[PDB]
Amino acid sequence: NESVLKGVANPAEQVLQTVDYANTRYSKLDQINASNVKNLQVAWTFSTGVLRGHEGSPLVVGNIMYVHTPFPNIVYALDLDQGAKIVWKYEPKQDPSVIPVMCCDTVNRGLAYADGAILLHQADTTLVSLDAKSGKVNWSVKNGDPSKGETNTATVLPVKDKVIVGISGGEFGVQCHVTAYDLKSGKKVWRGYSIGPDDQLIVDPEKTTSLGKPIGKDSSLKTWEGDQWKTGGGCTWGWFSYDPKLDLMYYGSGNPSTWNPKQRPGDNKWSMTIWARNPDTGMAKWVYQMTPHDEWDFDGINEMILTDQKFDGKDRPLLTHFDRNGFGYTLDRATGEVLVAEKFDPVVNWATKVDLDKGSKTYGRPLVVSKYSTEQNGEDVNSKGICPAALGTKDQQPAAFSPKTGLFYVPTNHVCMDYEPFRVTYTPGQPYVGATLSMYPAPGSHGGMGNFIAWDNLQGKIKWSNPEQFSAWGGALATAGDVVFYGTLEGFLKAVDSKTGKELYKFKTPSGIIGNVMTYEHKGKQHVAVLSGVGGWAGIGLAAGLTDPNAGLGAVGGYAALSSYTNLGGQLTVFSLPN
Ligand SMILES: O=C(O)c1cc(C(=O)O)c2c(n1)C(=O)C(=O)c1cc(C(=O)O)[nH]c1-2
Ligand SMILES: [La+3]
C-alpha cells in the first residue's frame, strides 16, 4: 500500500515486521550509535500475559504501539502517549486443537499495518483486518483448515490494494501456497501454489525462467510421482519482500512433504525454491530451486534481502538469501540469475558446493555428498554427522543488512544432526514426517551452537564471526549508528559494532529472545525494543514441556542446557538513553 511506503519513509515508525519492503532490517535512526550505546538503559517494560515463544516485533504506527502474542495471538494496542496504557485489546477465539497441529511451538511472527488497519494472521489460518484506532474487525477470512493440519505462523505482506499471506504445514502433508486477499473487503484474488499443475502454480511455461531458461510445461508435475504433490509441502511461513520498481514480490517455499526421501522420488518442485511473483496476478516471472529433492528438511523460506550493490563493477538489483542448507545465495532479483552461492558456516558438509558453471550439466544444483545423504543411506538407516541440522545454519530469525558497511549480519546456528528416515503413510490431520533426529553441537569450533557473523554477499565470505554458547534464534537489526542488535537464547540483548564486531552492550532480558529487535522514535527520542520469551524449535523443550531426548523432533535433547539459563516468558523490553 501507499500507506506502507509512507511508513517506511518515516524512520520513527515500524509498519512492517521486515522494517522495509526490501527486508533489509536497517533503520536510519542514529541517536543510539556506537559511541553511546554503552549508556543504553531500560525505559519501560510490558508483559503480554502469554507464555511459550514470542517471535516477531511490535509495530509502532504514529504514537501507538501494537504488540502481538503467540497462540491465541492476542493483539494489544499501547498508547505511547498515555504511558503505554492498553487502549484496545483483541483476544481471538481459536480451537486449542490447533496447537498439536503445529510443527514447532505456538509462535506467531507479527502483524502488519496498511490503510489504517492492523493485519493479523491467526494460528488457525484466519486472516483478520482490525481497525488501527479501535480494534474493531473490518473482515475475517479463513485461509485454510487446521483439520487437515494447516496452520499459520508467518506475517502478511500488504502490497497496493492486496494482502499476500502464507500457510504452514510442511510437516503435515499440506499442499501449501500463497494467497492474495483484497485489502478493503478480504475477498480472495489469486492463489499461487508452490507445487502442482501449472494453473495452480500460476506460472507461464514459456516466459517463467529458471536459471535463465524457461521452465516449460508441467515444470512441477514432472518431478513428482503420481498424486503425492497433493500432499507435497513447500510451505510459505517465512518473510516476504517486494520491489515496487520491478513489480515483484519474493518469498521462499518450504520442505517437500515428508522427511523420508525414498518414498518421494524426483526433484519435488517447486519446494525449496525462491519465488518472484506479480503481486496483482500472482504470475511468477522467475523461480529458482535451492535444495532439489530434499533429504534434510532445509526449508527454503528464509528472507530475501533486496539490495542495490555493485557486482563486477555494475550496479545490479540483487537478492541475498541465507538458506537453511548453509548456503548464502546472491541472485539478480530481476532475472533470477544466481551470482554467488557459498557456505556461511565452514562446517556445512551435506554438499561440496553449488555448481555455478554455466555449462556444467549440473548448473544451479548442489553437489550432494553421498556420505551425508539420507536417501542414499536408505530408509531406517541413521545418517550420522550431517551439518547443519534440520533447523539449518539459519532458521526463521531474519538477518540484517548495513548499506554503510555493505555487510550482512546473520544470526546463525552451529548444530549437526543424526538423521534416520522411515516410510510413513499419510493421514489427514496427522503428522507426515517419517524421521527420528538427534541434534548436537558441531564437533569443531568451541562447543557453541551459534554464531553472529558478518557476510559479504558479492564474494561470499565471512568478514568476522562472533561465537555464542547457544543458537542465535533472534532477529538482528542494523542502524545508521553503526550498531547491530540481536538477542541470545540465554536472554541477552547484545549490540555489536557494525564494522569491528566488538560487543558494546549486553543486558539480560527476562527470557530467551527469539523475536526480532526493532527501533522507533517517540517525542523525538529513539527507543529500541525487543520481545523476550524462549520458544520456537530451539526452545521447544521448554515450551512444550518435552522430557525425551528425541521428542520435539530432536531439538528437545539438543538444547537441554538451555533450561539452566531461561524459563518461559512473555515480556516486551524497551531501551533508550538517559535524558
Ligand atoms: O514446513 C513447515 O510447515 C514449517 C513451519 C514452521 C512454522 O510454521 O513455524 C517451521 C518449520 N516448518 C521448520 O522446519 C522449522 O524448522 C521451524 C522452526 C520454527 C520456529 O518457530 O523457530 N518454526 C518452524
Ligand atoms: La519444515
Judge contact between 50 and 543, C-beta under 8 A: no
The Å distance, Cα 435 to ligand 1 centre, comes to 16
Ligand nearest, relative to CA of residue 109: 1
Q: Is 255 helix (H, G, I), strand (E, B) or coil?
A: coil
d(CA 475, CA 461): 21
Q: Which ligand is nearest to the CA of 252?
A: 1
Q: What gap in Å lies between CA 84 and CA 207, rounded to an integer?
A: 52
Q: Bridge partners of 320?
A: 305, 330
The answer, yes or no, to whether any atom of ligand 1 lies below 6 A from the CB of 237, is yes
Cβ atoms of residues 400 and 484 within 8 Å = yes
Kindly give the distance from the C-alpha atom of residue 22 to the centroid of ligand 2, in angstroms, as a whole number. Answer: 24
* Residue among 175, 395, 419, 531 to mutate when testing ligand 1 (max atoms within 8 A of CB): 395
Question: Which residues are marked as active site?
Answer: 297
Q: Which helix (H) or strand (E) holds 7?
A: helix 2-8
Q: How far is the CA of 257 from the centre of ligand 2 (A)?
A: 8
- Determine if residue 537 is labeled as part of a ligand binding site: yes
Grid cell locating 182? 483484497
Compute CA distances 342 → 104, 279, 321, 326, 455, whole Å. 28, 30, 11, 8, 10
Q: Which has the closest alpha carbon to 400: 462, 478, 464?
A: 478
Q: Show Cβ contacts of residue 314 under 8 Å, excluding neighbours closer than 6 positions.
A: none
Atom 24 of ligand 1, nearest CA residue: 104
| Solving technique | X-ray
Check pocket membership of 395 for ligand 1, CB cut-off 6 A.
yes
Cα end-to-end distance, the chain, whole Å? 37
Beta carbons within 8 Å of 376's beta carbon, 6+ residues apart: 368, 370
d(CA 75, CA 61): 14
The protein residue with its alpha carbon nearest to ligand 1, atom 20, reads 536
The reply to whether ligand 1 has any atom less than 6 angstroms from the CB of 272 is no
- 275-308 b/e (C-beta count within 10 Å ≥ 16 → b): bbbbbeebbbbbbbbbbbbbbbbbbbbbbbbbbe
CA 257 distance to own-chain centroid: 19
Report which DSSP code applies to 542. Answer: H
Give the residue whose CA is nearest to atom 1 of ligand 1: 170
Q: Which atom of ligand 1 lies at the shortest distance from residue 105's CA?
A: 21
Is the beta carbon of 537 within 6 A of some atom in ligand 1? yes
User: Does residue 391 have its Cβ closer than 6 Å to ligand 1?
Assistant: yes
Set out the domains of the chain in order of their start, with CATH numbers: 1-579 (2.140.10.10)
CA of 504 to the centre of ligand 1 (A): 32
Give bridge partners of residue 213 from the DSSP assignment: 210
Asked if 162 and 180 touch (Cβ cutoff 8 Å), the reply is yes
The answer to whether the beta carbons of residues 477 and 397 sit under 8 Å apart is no
Q: Which residues of 262-274 are buried (b: 16+ CB within 10 A; e: fewer)?
A: bbbebbbbbbbbb
**For the CA of 254, the nearest atom of ligand 1:** 1
Gap between the Cα atoms of 295 and 388, Å rounded: 12
Q: Which amino acid is at 230?
A: K
Q: Which residue has the cell 518515516?
A: 10
The CA distance from 230 to 317, in Å, is: 35
Question: Cell numbers 534416520 label which residue?
Answer: 420
CA separation for the pair 448, 454 (Å, rounded): 17
**Spatial separation of the C-alpha atoms in residues 56 and 367, rounded to whole Å:** 35
By most ligand atoms within 8 Å of CB, the mutation choice from 99, 124, 168, 195 for ligand 1 is: 168
From the CA of 406, how far away is ligand 2's center (Å)? 31
What does 406-420 look like in DSSP terms, one character per residue?
A: TEEEEEEE-EEEEEE
How many Cα neighbours within 13 Å face the side chain of 340? Answer: 22
Pick from 78, 62, 56: nearest CA to 116: 62
Candidate of 237, 291, 437 to mutate for ligand 1, largest count of ligand atoms within 8 Å of Cβ? 237
* Ligand 1 pocket member 144 (CB < 6 A): no
3-class SS of residue 127: strand
Atom of ligand 1 nearest to the CA of 174: 3
Residues 6+ apart with CB under 8 A from 248: 242, 276, 277, 278, 279, 285, 333, 334
C-alpha cell at 537: 524449535
Helix or strand (DSSP H, E) at 375 = helix 374-377
Cα(481) to ligand 2 centroid in Å equals 36
- Does the CB atom of residue 383 touch ligand 1 within 6 A? no
Q: Are 190 and 178 in contact (CB under 8 A)?
A: no
Cα separation, 127 vs 406, whole angstroms: 37
Output the residue whose Cα is nearest ligand 1's atom 22. Answer: 536
Q: How far is CA 245 from CA 41, 94, 394, 434, 553, in A?
A: 40, 39, 29, 43, 42
C-alpha cell at 129: 483486518
Residue linked to cell 533447523: 391
Residue 256: left (phi > 0), alpha (psi -120 to 50), or beta? beta
Nearest-CA residue for ligand 1 atom 15 is 391
Amino acid present at 481: G
Q: 126-134 contacts: CB < 8 A, separation 24 or more? A: 126/92, 126/94, 127/156, 127/163, 127/165, 127/181, 127/186, 128/90, 128/92, 129/183, 129/186, 130/75, 130/90, 132/61, 132/64, 132/66, 132/77, 134/88
Q: Are 472 and 411 in contact (CB under 8 A)?
A: yes
How buried is residue 39: exposed, middle or buried, by Cβ count under 10 Å (0-12/13-18/19+)? exposed
The β-bridge relationship of strands 477-479 and 26-27 is: parallel
Sequence-distant (≥ 6) Cβ neighbours of residue 505 within 8 angstroms: 37, 38, 40, 493, 494, 495
